[PDB]
Design a protein around this nucleic acid. Sequence first.
RNA 1: GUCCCCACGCGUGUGGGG
Length: 204
Amino acid sequence: FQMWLTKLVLNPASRAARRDLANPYEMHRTLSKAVSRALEEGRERLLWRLEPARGLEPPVVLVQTLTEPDWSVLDEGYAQVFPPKPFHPALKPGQRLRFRLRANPAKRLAATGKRVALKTPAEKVAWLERRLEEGGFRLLEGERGPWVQILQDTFLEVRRLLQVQAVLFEGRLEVVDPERALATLRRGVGPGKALGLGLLSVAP
RNA sequence: GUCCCCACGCGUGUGGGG
């Protein structure tokens, strides 16, 4: 009942890597290969994130898996694989953690039956604040507002046309219910979990 | 500027029968 974290530094000289970097769907098919058997048996929840490019340095993909991944299934010269390490998220009540989450703040419009993205930063934060509170977490806050800043807001258009709003959050949260908090980290947060969203990363 | 599928809420009713 633990987790695995893998750091994949992709090689921009690879044609397979450039393809997967442009297409979150093609990245999803490639990353699924490492835990192909566990997904076939329906006991795996794959979560990944393309880390924000600080510039200069190569693309970094962080992959979280419930079962141990076998990264020998990647193409030759695809990525520099940093060995997967067992992740025990030992959480106590009232513990405060720095978090990073690229997610899809959206709502199911009842007039259309469709799922559309939220527009204002005020309701994007309100969405995050709701999802964390439902998942046993709670956003810390000062007197200006909640402890979170939106760093990226890009409208993704995956050609398999999949259209998902990708919002990158970063700030500080608190653990209220550690049992709920453990499950939230394992499940992920919000839609588009296959397309590189949902992965909630926590650090002290 | 949400493309497809599955499950399920909240609020408020319409019409018929005895």
